[PDB]
Design a protein around this nucleic acid. Structure first.
Lengths: 263, 126, 142, 182, 59
RNA sequence: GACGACCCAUUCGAACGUCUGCCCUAUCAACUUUCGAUGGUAGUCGCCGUGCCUACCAUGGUGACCACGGGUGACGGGGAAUCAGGGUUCGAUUCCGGAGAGGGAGCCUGAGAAACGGCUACCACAUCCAAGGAAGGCAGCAGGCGCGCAAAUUACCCACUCCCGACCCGGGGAGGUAGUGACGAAAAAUAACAAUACAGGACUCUUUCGAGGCCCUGUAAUUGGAAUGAGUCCACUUUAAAUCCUUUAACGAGGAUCCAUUGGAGGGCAAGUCUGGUCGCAGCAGCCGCGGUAAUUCCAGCUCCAAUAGCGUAUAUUAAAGUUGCUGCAGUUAAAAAGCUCGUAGUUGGAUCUUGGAGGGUGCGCCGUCCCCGCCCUGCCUCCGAAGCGUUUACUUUGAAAAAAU
């Protein structure tokens, strides 16, 4: 300990949702410092060699990266343990694949190919909205991108379509009763749904009652709610499953029925 | 007794210049098969040639007559020679290289540390 | 029922129990750390010492025999202890100034049988196992 | 590196009545030791305990439904259990033979291809038995339902074909060197 | 209260005329031996209702 | 095609601050401050809060709801073991948080250290010396001494897993890899099938004698064909390279083996109403008890039992133990109601304030049976939302927040 920043991760003390095995070694990658908090991220190495199967070694993951093969949000990233995350793009070119890091209904970064457009833009949730220096205002998104001069409607918890080459917000969505939502943490991590209610507490802690396209209702902390568009009208790709969440029995019913017969 | 080399789970992996797949080798009833026989035999299914089809892993199963492994076949012999683990290239008659075995070298370096800069001095001393 | 029954009265019940636990001998022994403090063996299971002398001890009635123990100074704490030497003629095998591995009876610290004030038994000499010695698997090395 | 024990000994140790019972089981069931039985008395007690818990739960109770049905389906795949059973109320009223009956050893008897729970175990432990592409030497196995049909001698053990036997082949060359020539 | 002697220590062990080991058979490997036990005990083992009998009897 | 900088945010953090939960002890009952104990007020200090420190000024703060003091086979937790249920005990130790690197104290650098594979003093230890000097800290990896009941190689590699650096390229006793390894856990070999040969029992036939007969087990007699790795071994696999496993040509099972053990056989307690020997001797025996001349307890064999690649023994502790008793103890006489009453804390407290008809789950062959629900035979006010907004709670109920391993 106690004099400085930790540089190692004991594997096992890594986040479950990477789904690294128990045996293999002692240490997991441990996310570099970056645009996404370490728990809530997906080090490229895990993406290249743990989800996509392009790499075997970590030696290979590096060999891939140094080529420049891979861009995150458009701008070649060359670090093994780069902390990619929710709403990130990731583009492997000489292979033609665009993927958006967005959740399972398990709560696992999903392998989700997106079109060669779309790859252009990402939706960021506003975290803070700011009068910076010289009297300029700025918004700050989840992914740690600061955009100056935003339009005055935009308020904390709203979301915001960023261009991506250029930065540049190219509109927005208000947080209001009835907006489509993505759940980014906690028990309900991955469930998508409309809203219904925000219960408000002074001092601390606002809950958001969500209802899914199945009249399934649930709550989380406001911190955990991300706005992604208008009911039935997401502003991004959703992964197969539309973040639905099915009981372990329903889940069994689908698994045996779709196959050992049903094509 | 004929064999049969079967390549399961294929991936075309451009960003490392090679097609990577499992190798499933039936040998019905004896055991086995040479790594060299396997690379020769594969070389002719993927239209590639031996020296681009590295092969590794491998464990004959339980009781006899099968062996599952893993193979790679590289699009440029250059691309292999560079994407390549070095120990892999060494294994067949194209790569070999220097040993030590390691503590002789560490000892050399620690001897060198004593001596102010120069150090080349320490090289002539080792 | 000798014991309040109020929803509140956790503290009285909890504490009344703490007070009576003492009478338990196993409990008290453990809390007073007696095994560390009084006992010849440390609070360990076995203990090795040097043989001072060989005793023929006078088995209690209604039994009648000469028992055959050694007196041993435990190296660990110089404590003086007498230990039984089991089986037929096995004294034979331990000599004065010997060394020996001693162990409890299996009585909880309470002497065994007719054998009076002896609470331990020899197990090894020749570092070498009375059993292996008695059988003649192994010898009185030297 | 996690590990667990697979058997449990009985509280008590000398109850003629229990000992006889176990011996009859070893005999019918070409078993090797008491542990061999104890291992199953243990397997069963946990199943029964699993069952009993479940049976105390409300029916329809997502926890009772989801895990009850699973325990049953698992118990049926192995033939251990049957449908009306195939509810929890019936596993409660079940027993050890029902498991013991599914091991290799007794099957290789049960269709001629051994004629002894005996013969069976030495056959199995000696590599002359595949469960369809795979030799299985574990007289201890547990033959799954739709796997019952695929059990047969192996591709090379002699029956199963393949020359003779390191001892049969000795005998062929046993009538060869002397009685043929010098 | 101790005084006394040991002269006699080991008197019976040393007076007990040694016996051969003799010999004979191997008894059987694991499960096979269990099998012989089960047939001798239970198959064998038919028993009579003789009001019982024994395992290590003479005449 | 080959890094700096200012300021802000970010990320990894840091440092402090909230509560609520900790072992034993009263043969520890009052404690804490003139070397600040508790508070005011202002400053100095610190990254910053703060008696941190200092002045002045108050005289506080804590305690039977166990403070204070002392003790400790106390690092704390996730966890582990023991399974009715309740519980009972452990936790140094693969993770998290905290602490230290001979003992003590100080400090430099740097964003981060009060760092010891930095330094510096003393203190305790040890070393070299040509005797003036000079250099050191395995609670890092191996190894060694001492200690003990007790614990492995002075071995190989950065290929895996990851880390660091100027770094794809180097470096890593992190870590992997082999060796030792009955903590302990999994799989489970040391021999299967006929035949004669026989030894036998339910079945049938017969008045009986007697004979047949199915199911077979032994038990020899050897046969007779039928078998597999344990070893050994071309080849090949494993992998950084090897080993072993998992792979196999050539070999490898007639018993005298390719040879299974460790405790028990009087009771509890499974198994000698033995044979030789001894004669309350040697020994056995947790306990009860055996042995003093027909010893089923000994000492040996023979024989048999039990657990079985394991088994005995000692010991901490747990279960058993409703012998610590919540659940769920006893106290007239068995171990145990104070001689009696008052009585504070604590505990404990009377009655009495609102009253069929269909919707949805799974069984049985369009019919119904059996739950569950708003009903029949109850937030006010502000003036649908919003807001006002709560009389306090405990309780219980429904959510979120809830490390992974386990």
């Amino acid at each position: 300990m106690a004099r400085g920043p930790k540089k190692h991760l004991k594997r096992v003390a890594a986040p479950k949702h990477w789904m690294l095995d128990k045996l293999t070694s002692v240490f997991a990658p441990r996310p570099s410092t970056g645009p996404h908090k370490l728990r809530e991220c997906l080090p490229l190495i895990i993406f290249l060699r743990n989800k996509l199967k392009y790499a075997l070694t970590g030696d290979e993951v590096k060999k891939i990266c140094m080529q420049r093969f891979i861009k995150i949000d458009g701008k070649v990233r060359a670090d093994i343990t780069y902390p990619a995350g929710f709403m990130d793009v990731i583009s492997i070119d000489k292979t033609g694949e665009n993927f958006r890091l967005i959740y399972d209904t398990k709560g696992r970064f999903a392998v989700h190919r997106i079109t060669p457009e779309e790859a252009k833009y990402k939706l960021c949730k506003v975290r803070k909205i700011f009068v910076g220096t010289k009297g300029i205002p700025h918004l700050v998104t989840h992914d740690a991108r600061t955009i100056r001069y935003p339009d005055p409607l935009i308020k904390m918890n709203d979301t915001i379509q960023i261009d991506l080459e250029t930065g540049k917000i190219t509109d927005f969505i208000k947080f209001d009763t009835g907006n489509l939502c993505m759940v980014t943490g906690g028990a309900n991590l991955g469930r998508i749904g409309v809203i219904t209610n925000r219960e408000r507490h002074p001092g601390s802690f606002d809950v958001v009652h969500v209802k899914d396209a199945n009249g399934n209702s649930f709550a989380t902390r406001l911190s955990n709610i991300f706005v992604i568009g208008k009911g039935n009208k997401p502003w991004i790709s959703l992964p197969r499953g539309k973040g639905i969440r099915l009981t372990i029995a329903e889940e069994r019913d689908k698994r045996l029925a779709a196959k050992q017969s049903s094509g | 007794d004929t064999v049969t080399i079967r390549t399961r789970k294929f991936m075309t992996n451009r960003l490392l210049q090679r097609k990577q797949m499992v190798i499933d080798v039936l040998h019905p009833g004896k055991a086995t098969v040479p790594k060299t026989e396997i690379q020769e035999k594969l070389a002719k299914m993927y239209k590639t040639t031996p020296d681009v089809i590295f092969v590794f892993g491998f464990r004959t199963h339980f009781g006899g007559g099968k062996t599952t492994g893993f193979g790679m076949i590289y699009d440029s012999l250059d691309y292999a020679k560079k994407n390549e683990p070095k120990h892999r290239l060494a294994r067949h008659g194209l790569y070999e290289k220097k040993k030590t075995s390691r503590k002789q070298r560490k000892e050399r370096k620690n001897r060198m540390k004593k001596v102010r800069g120069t150090a080349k001095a320490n090289v002539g001393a080792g | 029922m000798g014991k309040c029954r109020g929803l509140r009265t956790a503290r009285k019940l909890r504490s009344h129990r703490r007070d009576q636990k003492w009478h338990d001998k196993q409990y008290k022994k453990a809390h007073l750390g007696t095994a560390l403090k009084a006992n010849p063996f440390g609070g360990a299971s076995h203990a090795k010492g040097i043989v001072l002398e060989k005793v023929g001890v006078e088995a209690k009635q209604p039994n009648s025999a000469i028992r055959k123990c050694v007196r041993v100074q435990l190296i660990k704490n110089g404590k003086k202890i007498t230990a039984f030497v089991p089986n037929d003629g096995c004294l034979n095998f331990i000599e004065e100034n010997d060394e020996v591995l001693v162990a409890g009876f299996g009585r909880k610290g309470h002497a065994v049988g007719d054998i009076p004030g002896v609470r331990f038994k020899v197990v090894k000499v020749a570092n070498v196992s009375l059993l292996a010695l008695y059988k003649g698997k192994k010898e009185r090395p030297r | 590196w996690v590990c667990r024990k697979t058997y449990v000994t009985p509280r008590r140790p000398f109850e003629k009545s229990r000992l006889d019972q176990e011996l009859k089981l070893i005999g019918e069931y070409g078993l090797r030791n008491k542990r061999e039985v104890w291992r199953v008395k243990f397997t069963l007690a946990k199943i029964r305990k699993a069952a009993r818990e479940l049976l105390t739960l409300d029916e329809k109770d997502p926890r009772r439904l989801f895990e009850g049905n699973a325990l049953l389906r698992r118990l049926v795949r192995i033939g251990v259990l049957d449908e009306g059973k195939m509810k929890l109320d019936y596993i409660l009223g079940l027993k050890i033979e029902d498991f013991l009956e599914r091991r290799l050893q007794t099957q290789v008897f049960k269709l001629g291809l051994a004629k002894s729970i005996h013969h069976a175990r030495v056959l199995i432990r000696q590599r002359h038995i595949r469960v369809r592409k795979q030799v299985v030497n574990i007289p201890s196995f547990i033959v799954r339902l739709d796997s019952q049909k695929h059990i047969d001698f192996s591709l090379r053990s002699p029956y199963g074909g393949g020359r003779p036997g390191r001892v049969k082949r000795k005998n062929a060359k046993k009538g060869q060197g002397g009685a043929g020539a010098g | 209260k101790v005084h006394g002697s040991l002269a006699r220590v080991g008197k019976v062990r040393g007076q007990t005329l040694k016996v051969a080991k003799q010999e004979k058979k191997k008894k059987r490997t694991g499960r096979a031996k269990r099998r012989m036990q089960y047939n001798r005990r239970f198959v064998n083992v038919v028993p009579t209702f003789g009001k019982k009998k024994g395992p290590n009897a003479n005449s």
